[PDB]
């Protein structure tokens, strides 16, 4: 009926169905994984290409928000770009008004508040993407996930996308206390390669980024010759 056409309407059981539909759109997107390794955060996403003529690096889903913070997008890429722009605005406001890098928890809370505001008004629709915030700020390594509903949660390891449950199960086999980013990059790449179906997504690429002590606490992409071939 008309109980699921706009976000400003609660259902008879207290649900917002448009947000659930946006989350369903997120659940049909490419798989992403992330791990907090007690010395940094490593995020790895799979990019599915519908053409073999795409230039390398096309449709980047991992974007640096600050020097030490970055966001991976799982879902509608343009919505993720808007969220990344908002996060970059939040990060530079802290560096300009308060003369300090934005803490990972603070940035995650700002992203969640921004995403939640689009689930309360009839004139807007919720974002169709989940945001993975990887930061190495003065509060240590931080890994957060922001839901299209606007709720944020901190994780040691997290998986999102179509092949989410199997990737989460593979992540359950790690220790996350002795785990280091150097081996975590390979672990996440191997998990993404193993969990991906090779007969439906012919063109696939693994895009991995990280921010730990080895990059001077700067959120950058991996060196090209570090991820496994497959």
């Amino acid at each position: 009926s008309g109980h699921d056409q706009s976000t400003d309407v609660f259902s008879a059981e207290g649900r917002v169905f448009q947000v659930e539909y946006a989350g369903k759109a997120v659940d049909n997107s490419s798989t992403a994984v992330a791990a907090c390794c007690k010395d940094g955060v490593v995020v790895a996403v799979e990019k599915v290409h519908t053409s073999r003529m795409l230039e390398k690096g096309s449709n980047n889903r991992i974007h640096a928000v600050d020097r030490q913070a970055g966001i991976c997008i799982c879902g509608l890429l343009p919505d993720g770009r808007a969220i990344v722009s908002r996060a970059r605005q939040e990060a530079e406001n802290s560096r300009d008004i308060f003369a300090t890098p934005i803490r990972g928890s603070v940035l995650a809370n700002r992203v969640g508040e921004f995403m939640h505001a689009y689930t309360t008004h009839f004139a807007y629709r919720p974002f169709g993407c989940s945001a993975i915030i990887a930061s190495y700020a003065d509060d240590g390594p931080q890994l957060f996930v922001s839901d299209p509903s606007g709720t944020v949660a901190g994780y040691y390891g997290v998986a999102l996308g179509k092949a989410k449950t199997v990737a989460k199960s593979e992540l359950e086999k790690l220790d996350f206390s002795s785990l280091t980013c150097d081996e975590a990059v390979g672990k996440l790449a191997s998990i993404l390669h193993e969990v991906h179906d090779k007969q439906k997504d012919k063109l696939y690429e693994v895009e991995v980024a990280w921010v730990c002590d080895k990059s001077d606490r700067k959120f950058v992409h991996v060196p090209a010759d570090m991820v496994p071939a497959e």
């Binding site: 020097r67 300090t100 890098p101 190495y136 700020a137 003065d138 606490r217 700067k218």
Partner: protein, 229 residues
């Protein structure tokens, strides 16, 4: 301009900087602001150079004739009175701060201050010029009356150095003259041998941390002095 005069037991020591500045440019960096009035009486001049030079020349001419007329020496009080009268009759047309310091056999060493207003005050020590404002708390803390001749000269040089270290209108050479019952003795110490300057002060060696490198932390770690770093 920094001028001062300090009395010790024997006589007086007059100290001054050497800098005539047209606002922000140094017209002269080897000025001589200790102007001879008689053999044992001198004046420190601050303010308008032409006005102070004319005042000193007129007073010296008046005093030289007075010695011949009376056939004896001149007290410091007479020169102080001459400057006080001449500066009070012209207080609206001239910009001059005068220190009259000297030795006479009757009253020993004397120091008189004649500010821009035209008054005359007999003091143990006197300060004048734009750089004098920096020295008052220096004298309240570090100056002890009753020093020896060499101690007084050293203290006057140190005070002048401290004064022009902070005053942009003062600087250059430090000129001192000692006037007492013996032969008056002058001294000119250069800036590179000055008793104090902030350039050689070890507590101003470390630069203020203003140019922060772009960092992922709020920890302050010094200035960025390299493109790579």
């Amino acid at each position: 301009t920094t001028i001062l005069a300090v009395s010790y037991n024997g006589g007086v020591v007059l100290a001054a900087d050497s800098r005539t500045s047209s606002g922000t440019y140094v017209v002269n960096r080897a000025s001589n602001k200790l102007t001879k009035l008689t053999k044992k009486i001198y004046c420190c001049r601050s303010g308008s150079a032409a006005d102070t030079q004319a005042l000193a020349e007129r007073v010296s001419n008046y005093l030289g004739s007075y010695q011949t007329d009376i056939g004896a020496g001149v007290n410091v009080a007479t020169a102080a009175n001459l400057f006080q009268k001449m500066c009070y009759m012209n207080r609206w047309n001239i910009s001059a701060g005068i220190i009259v310091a000297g030795y006479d056999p009757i009253n020993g060493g004397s120091v008189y201050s004649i500010p821009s207003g035209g008054s005359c005050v007999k003091l143990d020590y006197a300060l004048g010029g734009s750089g004098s404002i920096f020295l008052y708390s220096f004298f309240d803390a570090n100056y002890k009356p009753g020093m020896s001749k060499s101690e007084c000269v050293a203290f006057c040089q140190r005070a002048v150095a401290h004064a022009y270290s902070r005053d942009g209108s003062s600087g250059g050479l430090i000129r001192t003259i000692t006037l007492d019952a013996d032969e008056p003795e002058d001294q000119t110490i250069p800036w590179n041998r000055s008793p104090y300057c902030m350039e050689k002060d070890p507590k101003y060696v470390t630069q203020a941390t203003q140019n922060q490198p772009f960092s992922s932390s709020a920890k302050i770690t010094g200035n960025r002095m390299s493109s790579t770093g």
